[PDB]
C-alpha cells in the first residue's frame, strides 16, 4: 500500500526488535496464502535468518518457496490441530 518494509528499519534497530518488527510484518504477509499456518510459517522463516528474508521476500520463487516449505514441514507436527 505505502512505505513497504525496508532493511533500514532493522539497520537502525537492535537484534531483538528485528525479528519483532520483521516477523510482525511477515505474519500477515504470509496469511496471503496461509492465513492459518501463517504463525508457524513466519516463525521458522524468522528463525533461519531475518536478513535472508529481507532478500527473499523480494522474490516470488523465494516467498512461495519458503511458505510452501514451512507448511510442508508442519505436516509432521500438525496441520490445523485436527489430528
Amino acid at each position: 500500500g505505502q512505505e513497504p518494509l525496508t532493511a533500514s528499519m532493522l539497520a537502525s534497530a537492535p537484534p531483538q526488535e528485528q525479528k519483532q518488527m520483521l516477523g510482525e510484518r511477515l505474519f500477515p504477509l504470509i496469511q496471503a496464502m496461509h492465513p492459518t499456518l501463517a504463525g508457524k510459517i513466519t516463525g521458522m522463516l524468522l528463525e533461519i535468518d531475518n536478513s535472508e528474508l529481507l532478500h527473499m521476500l523480494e522474490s516470488p520463487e523465494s516467498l512461495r518457496s519458503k511458505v510452501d516449505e514451512a507448511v510442508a514441514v508442519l505436516q509432521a507436527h500438525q496441520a490445523k490441530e485436527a489430528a
Binding site: 531483538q16 519483532q20 516477523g23 510482525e24 521458522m44 524468522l46 528463525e47 519458503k66
Partner: peptide, 19 residues
Amino acid sequence: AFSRQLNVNAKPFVPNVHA
C-alpha cells in the same frame, strides 16, 4: 530452507503481545 526440509520445533518469535 537449507538442503530440503527444516525444523518445526523452531520457536516463533518475540511479538509485542502482552495483555
